[PDB]
Symmetry: C2
Subunit: 136 residues, 2 copies
């Protein structure tokens, strides 16, 4: 009745635990919060030059923010920081109704419907904006 | 295809914030885990003799474990330890195929369908089993 946003894809990725945790002696730690809804995420990174070698997250939030965090990590590991930022910008364009590169986003496109729920847009965007700040 | 278990009731209650937190100088603190899923809950209690005056939880988990925790807290605050244990016994009976008292459960009946998913039964039961240990 008002929970339609929660697709099978979102609920699967929300419960994924493989990227949840801390990285000891991380090269970068970045905390983000979407206090409108009450979500928090802490991203931990290892880099090798400009390559993202590993990412884990701590904290917890709604199923949209957690699903988004997990699909984000799964897609940015092994990429360069520039590539992850290009992906981020496209993820944000997708929510703002602007134009985006489907090939760049891959399975991130499964969050397309979130843009129909303007408060949950912040939930989807939290890990990505957190990533943006961290990588600059 | 698998998100059917996630009703509006469950999704609304999984996001509830008013019971999430610690109680300083709690009269009882009990931790519980459902490792097959990755769910954690720490329950904090204040009592006045046999009456449950306040309950909060920390930790996080799936939508079913978090929804169940919040519905439990909402229903047990202001009851006696024994009323809470009787609710708990009924909730577990529901999950197994056994007989239960609908008037004792109230909105806890909204989880009836979970019993068709043996793995998720543990998610539902996590707060209740943790409560049982805490109170006895
Ligand atoms: Ni709904
Ligand atoms: Ni955790
Ligand atoms: Ni920073
Ligand atoms: Ni489904
Ligand atoms: Ni919390
Ligand atoms: Ni104990
Ligand atoms: Zn959220
Ligand atoms: Zn669970």
């Amino acid at each position: 009745g008002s929970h339609m946003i929660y697709s099978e894809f979102i609920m699967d990725y929300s419960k994924l635990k493989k990227f949840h945790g801390k990285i000891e002696n991380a090269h970068k730690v970045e905390e983000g919060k979407n206090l409108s809804c009450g979500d928090e995420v802490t991203l931990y990174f290892l880099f090798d030059g400009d390559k993202i070698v590993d990412v884990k997250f701590e904290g917890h939030g709604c199923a949209i923010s957690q699903a988004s965090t997990n699909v984000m990590i799964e897609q940015i590991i092994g990429k360069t920081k520039q590539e992850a930022l290009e992906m981020m910008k496209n993820a944000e364009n997708m929510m703002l109704g602007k134009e985006f590169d489907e090939n760049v986003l891959g399975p991130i496109i499964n969050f397309y419907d979130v843009k129909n729920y303007p408060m949950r847009v912040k939930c989807f965007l939290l890990p990505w904006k957190t990533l943006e700040i961290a990588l600059k």
